[PDB]
Amino acid sequence: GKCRGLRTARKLRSHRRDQKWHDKQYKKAHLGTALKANPFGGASHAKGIVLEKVGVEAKQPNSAIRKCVRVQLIKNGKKITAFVPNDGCLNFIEENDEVLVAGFGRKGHAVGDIPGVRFKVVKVANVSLLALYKGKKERPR
Amino acid sequence: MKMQRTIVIRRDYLHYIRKYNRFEKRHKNMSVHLSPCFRDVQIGDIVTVGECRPLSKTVRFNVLKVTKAAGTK
Amino acid sequence: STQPRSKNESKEDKRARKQAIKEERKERRVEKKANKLAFKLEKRRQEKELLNLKKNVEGLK
Amino acid sequence: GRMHAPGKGLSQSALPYRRSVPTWLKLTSDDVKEQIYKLAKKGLTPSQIGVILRDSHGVAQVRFVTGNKILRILKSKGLAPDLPEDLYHLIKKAVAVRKHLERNRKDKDAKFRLILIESRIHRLARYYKTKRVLPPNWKYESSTASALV
Amino acid sequence: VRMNVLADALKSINNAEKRGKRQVLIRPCSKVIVRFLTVMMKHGYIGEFEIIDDHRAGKIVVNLTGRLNKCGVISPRFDVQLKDLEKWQNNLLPSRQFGFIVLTTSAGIMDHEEARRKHTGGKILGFFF
RNA sequence: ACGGUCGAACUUGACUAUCUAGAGGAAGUAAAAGUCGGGUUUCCGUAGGUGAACCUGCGGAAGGAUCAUUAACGG
RNA sequence: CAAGACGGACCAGAGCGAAAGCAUUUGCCAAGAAUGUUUUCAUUAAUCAAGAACGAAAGUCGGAGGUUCGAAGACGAUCAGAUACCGUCGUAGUUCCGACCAUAAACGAUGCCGACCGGCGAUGCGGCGGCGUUAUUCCCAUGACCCGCCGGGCAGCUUCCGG
RNA sequence: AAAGUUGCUGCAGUUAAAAAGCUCGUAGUUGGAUCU
RNA sequence: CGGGGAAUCAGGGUUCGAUUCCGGAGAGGGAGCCUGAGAAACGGCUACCACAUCCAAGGAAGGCAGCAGGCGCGCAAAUUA
User: Fold this and answer.
1) Where are residues bearing N6-acetyllysine located in the sequence (chain D)?
2) Spatial contact of B35 and B27, defined as CB atoms under 8 Å apart
3) Which residues of chain E have a CB within 8 Å of the CB of D1?
4) Phi, psi (degrees; rounded to nearest 5) at E6
């Protein structure tokens, strides 16, 4: 049982911080290795250069080829696979162009069918995928 | 009582932590000057000091009176 | 040395046989530890390999 | 609950509510004190003096008859020994276990109980150092142990 | 070992209140225990009692009515200022209409409403309803 | 200009830590349909058997499905 | 005749120990719980970072010994593909003495100390009260039984206490 | 914030994650009645 | 960088505070000084280090973490009024 005395504030705060280190979110936030392993470097978005297009197979009960691209981030050079969302949207991307990439949703976790993909593309050649898909703007090269 | 005409006293207090509403025992050491008119001062007896100008690197208080230990005759 | 001990065996014959068994066992434990370490390094290299294979250069185009 | 045992005994004395000297006890306090003096001259602990007075002389409680307890009467007269009774017996027990362990080397049970008796000795000496019955520099040593007894 | 003899007393009183017994024997006794039971008596909660004097710590025989729901000690005796008494009587008492934080102050041992009247603070001992 | 002082910075080894070029080594991946092709109740610790698995030795667990019998005991 | 091992049945939900554990007689050695007490001291205590003692089996260094059993190992049997099971033999080990090792389903898969909340009669130890039977009708106390109570124990049964 | 899923208020540890093999022991924490 | 404070919140709490108010610190990096009531000042000076400007090749001049503006950097921020 818990110590409950009047002069036990040191034991209580010491025990709380040691046992705080056993939480998954607390350790991911405060130990410093998750921020050094994060490709985005703790940023909401990052810009990169497309290296390859790649077709990634959906996890077992779904059967599809999810269209992704392999990008290399500008600021650190780390390599990323990023999903291109809507249908036909892969045809807007060519090789070696700037791509703005955001998170997919689950803060570093794979989302849905796509295995190992944490990222989705947001912009190509500084026009959004949404305006390109709905035909609101055109991309230069 | 190991330095030359200067002693080391400690002061004990309780520091309050609001989140647990409790205390922790904390202490601070102090080198103070002991004049030779307080002879046969022993370890563990209570001493009353008063603030004066810095006399050393670490000495800023001067012993004003000494009361013996709670049991010492 | 699969030599059963004779009832006529005396000292410095049983002692020699026992010492031979001890030194055989020490050498065999040493190379058992060596094989454990080698398999450990190989397994770590193979897992680095598989993780790299999943991360990049795996797909269609 | 014992301090070093898993047992929980209830064996102890129960003083009566009547704190008065009984009528049939025809002893003054002076004669009881003198009896304590001669029993100390024979050479005994205060516990033994209390037992001898209880069994043979009808003195149910010495401090109800004299108004003081036995070791205080001894100390005021000057017949109390320098180290206390319970501590002296603890040291004597530890000395006996030490002698037995110098005899027998493989006895681990004796080594365990020896550790327990040493711990009792240290706790009692700590208490008597606080109360200033022992000198502050008193210490139990493994080597100079039988010199005290 | 035994610490907090008030805790022992209040626990034995509660455990006989749940079983519905008519009398409780609490041992050992104290001045703090006697002042607590007096406060519980003056609100009609505990009922009239006896102190048995053995020449050791006494015993108390408490006659019970079926009125006490919970009898409790708060340990340690936290320092309760008058500005923080409201949070205490929100945490411990079931209603704003009944129930009592017993606290000891330099005016004596009282309940919280008397401490509001006498304008003092103290240390928390318990609560009963 | 002598000397002192404060003192940037330099040179040389050690201890490092980083950045950046690299002959070669050892891999996988995609392209070659090319060539050849029965047993265990469930465990624990330790040791051996080619690392582990698994099996055996030794000591432990149940976290494994109690039927039947039981009054005399004296001469 | 010898050697080394092992102490069955008696042996129980009986006992003892901090746990691991502990069963042939006798003697020594020093400890120990409980109980009894109108003895003594008078708070000396609880739980414990650090630090220490002990810690099954297996294992490892030195010496001694090797009866049994027996990992490894040798054979024999067994099959489309058998390399574990099975039988005979057998090394380290299993035994002792001095060192290390510090692990177990090291279990109640259940911290320790204190308090309160229902009942019951069996048992182990200690103590108390009491008719009787027995020691070939015991001459007195004493042991063995029998009936009740109290205290700490190992357990059990019963319960719509409450969870 | 929801998270009483960090718990002082206020969690948990037989079978779900979890009580150290055992005991001693210092610091630390806690400590029985008793005086208008 | 610290405080004042901010977001959230039953009660207890968790998190933020580069940032206009108060305090400190520093002007590319160190170090030394002159003057002066006050500076180890940099929209003062003297070196060294790292950058870098004009040269007739001897020499000379530098310091936007002021306002505007530019490059670079990046997911990320205004007018040379």
Assistant:
1) 26
2) no
3) 1
4) -65, -40
Q: Which residue in the block uniquely carries the two structure tokens 């370490």? A: C37
Q: B29, B10 in Cβ contact below 8 A?
A: yes
Which positions 1-20 on chain C have a beta carbon less than 7 angstroms from any atom of strand F? Answer: none
Q: B-chain residues within 8 Å CB-CB of A8?
A: 20, 22
Q: Which two tokens stand for residue C15?
A: 């002692």
Residue type, D56: S
Query: Do A and B count as touching (3 or more CB pairs closer than 8 A)?
Result: yes
Residue C61 and residue A56: Cβ atoms within 8 Å?
no
Cβ–Cβ under 8 Å, residues A73 and A39? yes
Distance F1 C1' – C31 CA (angstroms): 79
DSSP summary character for residue D23: T
DSSP string, E3-65: --HHHHHHHHHHHHHHHT-SEEEE-S--HHHHHHHHHHHHTTSS--EEEE--SSS-EEEEE--
Distance from CA(B24) to C1'(G80), angstroms, rounded = 80
Mutate to test the interface with A, among C50, C54, C56, C57 (most CBs of A within 10 A): C56
Please state whether the peptide bond connecting residue A115 to the residue before it is cis, i.e. omega within 30 degrees of 0: no
CA dihedral sign, ordered D116, D121, D126, D131: positive
Selection from E95, E36, E91, E97 nearest residue E62 by Cα: E36
What nucleotides of chain F have any atom within 7 angstroms of a protein Cβ? 27-29, 48-52
Contacting residues for A8 by C-beta, under 8 A, at least 6 apart: B20, B22
- Beta-strand relationship, A79-83 and A119-124: parallel
DSSP β-ladder status, E79-80 and A79-83: unpaired
**Exposure of A82 in the CB half-sphere (CA atoms within 13 A):** 33
Q: What is the resolution of this structure in A?
A: 3.1
Query: Is C56 part of the contact surface with chain A (CB cutoff 8 Å)?
Result: yes
A134 in Cβ contact with A89 (< 8 Å): no
**E31-CA/H36-C1' distance, Å:** 13
Place of tokens 């040593």: D141
Residues whose CB is less than 8 angstroms from the CB of residue D10 and which lie 6 or more positions away in sequence, other chains included = none
Closest by alpha carbon to A30, among A38, A40, A20?
A: A20
**DSSP letter for each residue of B48-73:** EEEE-S--SSS--EEEEEEE--SS--
Q: What single string gives the DSSP state of each residue in E100-129?
A: B-EEEETTEEEEHHHHHHHT--EEE-EEE-
Residues 6+ apart with CB under 8 A from D138: D125, D128, D129
| CB hemisphere CA count around E51 (13 angstroms) | 14
Experimental approach was cryo-EM
Report the gap between the CA of E77 and the closest CA in chain A (Å). Answer: 8
With a 7 Å cutoff on the CB, does A84 touch strand I? no
Report which DSSP code applies to A90: G
